[PDB]
Design a protein around this ligand. Structure first.
Ligand SMILES: CC1(C(=O)NNc2ncnc3nc[nH]c23)CC1
Ligand SMILES: CC1(C(=O)NNc2ncnc3nc[nH]c23)CC1
Length: 167
């Protein structure tokens, strides 16, 4: 038993809720919150901009030091950094950005990072401003992640569509 509430169960291990991931993170304090990162960890908008804003820019400060030491992530890759006031840890995961021409096949590789963590609060990778079809992203999530994932979907209209079309 864990503290996530109001989720609809899609599979053995995948759950989904219409929620703001920032508000869900601040209430749950999960062990891991996933950020929809880019390779530079520049948290300007979308989920990343919202998570970073909720940390009062501390996420960005930590991220800039990470990049200065390690260089950019790979598309499909990840790194574990602090969760600041939102979670114990933040798993920054880079899904492909269709608005940058990145290969959508890398979405499966991106979701594989989730398997290194027993439980995660996460957004749909490559959705929103990353330009992928969220229904496809949900399918890849279900078919790739084996650990317990709690998906927060900000848009109520999208949440209802994800649910109604789920196979
Ligand atoms: C959770 C998410 C998002 O953008 N939430 N909305 C807002 N977040 C932060 N400050 C806001 N001020 C008005 N709306 C705001 C999808 C990334
Ligand atoms: C329609 C929409 C979506 O479905 N997911 N993105 C997000 N998911 C969870 N929390 C978020 N806070 C800001 N954007 C968020 C916003 C792009």
């Amino acid at each position: 038993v864990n503290s996530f509430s109001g989720y609809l169960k899609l599979t053995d291990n995948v759950y989904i809720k219409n929620a703001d991931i920032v508000e869900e993170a601040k209430k749950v304090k999960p062990t891991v919150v996933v950020n929809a990162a880019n390779v530079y960890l520049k948290h300007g908008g979308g989920v990343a901009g919202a998570l970073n804003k909720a940390t009062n820019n501390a996420m960005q400060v930590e991220s800039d030091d990470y990049i200065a030491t390690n260089g950019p992530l790979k598309v499909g890759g990840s790194c574990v950094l602090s969760g600041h006031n939102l979670a114990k840890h933040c798993l920054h995961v880079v899904g492909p950005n269709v608005n940058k021409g990145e290969d959508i096949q890398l979405l499966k590789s991106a979701y594989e990072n989730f398997n290194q963590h027993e439980v995660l609060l996460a957004p749909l990778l490559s959705a929103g401003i990353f330009g992928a079809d969220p229904i496809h992203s949900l399918r890849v999530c279900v078919d790739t992640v084996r650990t317990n994932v709690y998906l927060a979907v900000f848009d109520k209209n999208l949440y209802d569509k994800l649910v109604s079309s789920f196979l």
